[PDB]
From Swiss-Prot, chains A, B:
<protein>
    <recommendedName>
        <fullName>Uncharacterized protein 56B</fullName>
    </recommendedName>
</protein>
<dbReference type="GO" id="GO:0006355">
    <property type="term" value="P:regulation of DNA-templated transcription"/>
</dbReference>
């Protein structure tokens, strides 16, 4: 629930793929990034 | 290589966990997000 902001320069096709993912699941772009980066740390290490 | 910008409000601990991941691997925050969101789409569907 504690929030922060993030302003980065990421690739288009990749961010946009996820954008389409957010369109398909009607998800929020942010929510998807957070899920992405969340399941990424656990899939990796942290 | 085609770049875009992204400005969202994501959780702290989560984004910050990844920040520590970027500190540990000396990675770039953005590069980590992109890897995160990349491996997320493929782990999911797209």
């Amino acid at each position: 629930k504690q929030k922060a902001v993030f302003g980065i320069y990421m690739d288009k096709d990749l961010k946009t793929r996820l954008k389409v993912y957010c369109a398909k699941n009607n998800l929020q772009l942010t929510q998807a990034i957070e899920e992405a980066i969340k399941e990424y740390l656990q899939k990796r290490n942290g």
